[model samples]
Target chain A: FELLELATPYALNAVSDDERADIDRRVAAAPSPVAAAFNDEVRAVRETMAVVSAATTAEPPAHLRTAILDATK
Target chain B: DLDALLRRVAHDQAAFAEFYDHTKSRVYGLVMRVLRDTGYSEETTQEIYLEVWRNASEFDSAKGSALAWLLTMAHRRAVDRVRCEAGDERRRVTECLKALTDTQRQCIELAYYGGLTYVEVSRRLAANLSTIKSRMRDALRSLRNCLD
Candidate 1:
């Protein structure tokens, strides 16, 4: 029910850490069919993420590394 | 692969450098897609790498892959920026987002672009909390279907 609904928000990192942990527990304990649905939801989101990751063939500009490292120091 | 790099980064500056090199493009691209503002994307991308370096030790391989962890952070930060700074942009309702029903689109917009929690979104939309959650669930399912 509401337990499975948390999958998308959890994928998006929208929920609080405690809520996320609780959702994880619920998903793990869910019935086989319900667990499969949750897994499919997560896999769908990750697939979209992979597409987004693949779309940008261009690398970050070379100088950005120096800029980032300098900022860290 | 990244697990070793992340572990090394916890103690080695050079490892952090390598990690930044390997990941910055994907991070920047993901941020740019969300923010749509070059200057802001660049700034946010840098902040993301810095956070990764500082928090590398906190990453758990058991939870997910390194790239997933990195992109999740990027998505969250970019969405936060959009929510705070781009009011009209959030309201524009892009064609892709239009795949969902009006209510579902609105709920997704408030949750993802406005960075509003389900509770806050339900309050703002004058809907039940459970109703809001259901809409979001359906919205995400539809978006995944359409986007893929």
Candidate 2:
């Protein structure tokens, strides 16, 4: 769930505000030591998406295919 | 059936390139997400894709969707690479699971292994709406605690 939200280029805006609100309420209520870390993960997925979008705009080098094929074959 | 498509492309460089173009983004995306290392992820992505090119004829459509077959292949290969390079630390196993509250475990299993929508899992568990929400929130908390 976290990885999909973070890594998917597709935005999850289709999810309802009530869903988001529900998620929000639960996090705010958590008493676990992992609460802050969990919050960081939820935040990280979005942050990682932003990073991947900027980082992977280009196709990898053309030679990459040939190189790998050669190494294995 | 995906095999038929790949078999048709096996001898055709243009067809292979076309196939590569069509699937590269998703392949690379899954690789990067798993390895979280740009250089190594890029390398493994190429290795996996190249394996597909060489072995496209081996694909079994009866097993799954073409995309699922491809993605599953890429996922396993990348996971193997991550495990080999980083050893067992990368798999995110039960230690992470143990940290989760019972509520959080259900939320995660429903969404992930159970393949339930949040609303659907909420209904099945008879969890109050907030219970579902808090569990998901706490689940991520537990995962990060184990990971970091």
Candidate 3:
């Protein structure tokens, strides 16, 4: 399940693009069995990471609010 | 909601502002974790949203949440900078397989089944998914050729 397990971080993008490229290619070409597992795991990993991300809360700098808003304008 | 706000970012400034206000913290925090360098935080965070402003339509709500989409992009962007900053040290005069660590080889051995294959090595050799990545590029890529 190393491929299955590491696929979790690939979902989170913790791995290098080189590795993700390999997984993306593998998943893209896979039939239902591996494809199915990859889909479920990707969703599951992302769902869990959402909560983990919430715990480390650091606000954007005050100046950035204006800077970002202006740039979009 | 980001799904709604993000949808508007494609064309309107108002929607992108709303999107930035709501999601900026998460994007900043996530990039900070990956980069661990505050100097690049605001600059990098700005770049991420700029990307969003340009490609907001690419966010597919059916595939995943807006947060997941944002964070994944933020992390990858952060690491791209991280590797760029470290490129000098990463390329060293010393080139030897001995530089490889035990956990790294553990991932390679357990993950590689003698060829360019992955099949958990043994009852004892396996390691976590997080540690595997830091070691993957250097060890596995080379050892993959290192193997029979």
Candidate 4:
């Protein structure tokens, strides 16, 4: 139950490293169906995000790359 | 492809240049979506790439894909910017945020933008633990529905 609550944020990398490890442990130990459900939710959220992001994805301004390289020097 | 890029980036400036050309757009796009400001997004995108250059060797396919790793950094940096720029600007409501209840919206904002944990959001809002959890869960569901 607690794992379910933490799953979304865990997917988002919002939790601390320690909490994330805990989430992994619980999900791994859960029943197969339960674990699958949680994994499904995480995948769905990430996929949805990717879809929306794809719409706006464009070539990065050419100068920006040059600028980044220059800045690193 | 990305594994090859990461290896090159770790050792060769020319490889870094190629990697930057390939991945910068996706990185910039992800940051822009979160920030909604070109200037800030550009600045943050630059920072993200620099980190990528420095940390290329740390890329581990065992953890996640390269794009996911890059965008995760982009999202975290943009969220940090949102929290740092908190004021009327941060408070400016968006269509997606409007889908949530006031409490739910606030909880989501703090958690997503401020990078607060559930317990931290609960403490900051002076709300009960269960209340914060429920609100955050509902808010995320609404965002997925609205955005997806």
Candidate 5:
């Protein structure tokens, strides 16, 4: 229950590196169900912030697509 | 499936292109929003796709949606570019804060907006760790209630 408090900030990408390390370490040590539950909470939190990703008023320049495509290939 | 599509990105250049076409707007829009500079945003967007192609196989769909994963990765990448805004919308986001306590709201601003860790927030505000976590917990729940 206590570690779950970290879920909100963790989803916001707000945790310190060390705190993230500790959460990962402890969650792994917990039973599978607890770990799954914690992950679900974080996912739900991220799901809520999808608004930021969806608010797309701008698009990349046309040529950049070719650059990204060629570069990735 | 965007999730299924990415796994193939490792070897299928075709899949990579589609993923770029499909996801580029949100990804670019997000990076642009954060960097607010066209040259750097384009470079970072290019960089992000490269990583996706290279690391696609590592992403696990059982854990979360691809969009969430992308946004999380993008937000981290963008934030890493600063340790770095205000927009007007009352945004449902801005409007949501009216529901939080001053302490709860401040915690969100410091940690969520300023990129301070909870530990950093606690020390900066001279509050206890437990206290800060509780406030964040409250604030985030309140945000989910309002913004979601």
Candidate 6:
């Protein structure tokens, strides 16, 4: 429930207004402040996660990595 | 050891690689972690190693290990890259933090600058996920509030 709540706003933030209306139509959804809050949080988290995830896989360029390795060896 | 070899090379440029081989790996790892891009990592690594090769005579073991010395130099250079590439984004985040509560500010700094994850911060702070989540949500909201 916490993760869902956190993610909902994040998902909403990325959606276009037309897509949101479609989403509302598909879900036969009724709006609530709580849902809005959750959606916003989800959007914020998604952006944050992007940077954090990139932080994991982003390594220095090839020549730099080797040079450093070469220096340490 | 490269230190001894460096002593030999301090007076000679040809002796660089012998010293270079001794401390390259640790230097590489530090750059990889900080730069986080393999291609850039390699480029910076080359620059750093070459710098070391040229400056071997400047090494001072009395201050630290040759690896640490190498790493410090590499780290400083890598940070310079981060500053140039991510400068605006970094500043935006820092600016947004102005509205955060003290607790939120602490959390963001620890998580971002200190490299701790939300879960890690929760465990360290002896708080549950919900509490941490709530604080983070409040923090972001406050930031938006300030900006808007």
Q: Whole-model Cα lDDT per candidate?
A: 0.71, 0.53, 0.62, 0.69, 0.76, 0.53
True contacts kept of each: 0.32, 0.04, 0.35, 0.32, 0.62, 0.05
Per-model i-RMS in Å?
Answer: 7.1, 12.4, 12.0, 7.5, 3.9, 15.2
Using all chains and alpha carbons, the TM-scores for the candidates as numbered come to 0.62, 0.42, 0.68, 0.59, 0.79, 0.39
Which residue runs does candidate 6 get wrong by more than 4 Å? A1-73, B13-15, B86-148
Model 6 lDDT tens row, A1-73: 4434334222313223354465556334534664555444544553343322222233333454344434544
Residue B22 error for model 6, in Å?
A: 3.0
Q: Could you give candidate 4's per-residue lDDT for residues A1-73 as a string of tens digits?
A: 6657776666555665577688888898999988978877665544434433444465667779888887656
lDDT of 5 by residue, B3-72 (tens): 8787777676587878778778878877777677898888888878878877777788887777777777
Considering lDDT, which of the candidate structures 1 and 6 is the better prediction for this target?
A: 1
Per-residue lDDT of model 1, residues A19-64, tens digit only: 7688888887889999888876765665455434544423677777
Better of 4 and 6 by lDDT: 4
Among all windows of ten consecutive residues in candidate 6 chain B, which has the lowest summed lDDT?
Answer: B108-117
Candidate 2: pairs in clash: A26-B134, A38-B141
lDDT of 3 by residue, A1-73 (tens): 4456556456545455577688888887888887878787677556544534553446877898888888866
lDDT of 1 at B104: 79
Candidate 3, after superposition: displacement of residue A42 in Å?
1.2
Residues B1-148, candidate 1: write the lDDT tens digits.
8777777777556877877777777678767767777888888988898888788889877656677777778777887786566223223324447656899778756665456667778789888867877787788777667665
Q: Which candidate is the best by lDDT?
A: 5
lDDT of 5 by residue, A1-73 (tens): 8878888788877886677888989988988888888888889877666654554435679999888788753
Q: B19-60 in candidate 4: lDDT tens per residue?
A: 787767767876776788888889899999888888888987
Instruction: Arrange candidates by TM-score, descending.
Output: 5, 3, 1, 4, 2, 6
**Residues B43-106, candidate 2, lDDT per residue (tens digit)?**
8887787777777767655533455556656655665564345114323444566567787767
Error of 1 at B97 (Å): 12
TM-score of chain A of each: 0.66, 0.47, 0.78, 0.68, 0.81, 0.36
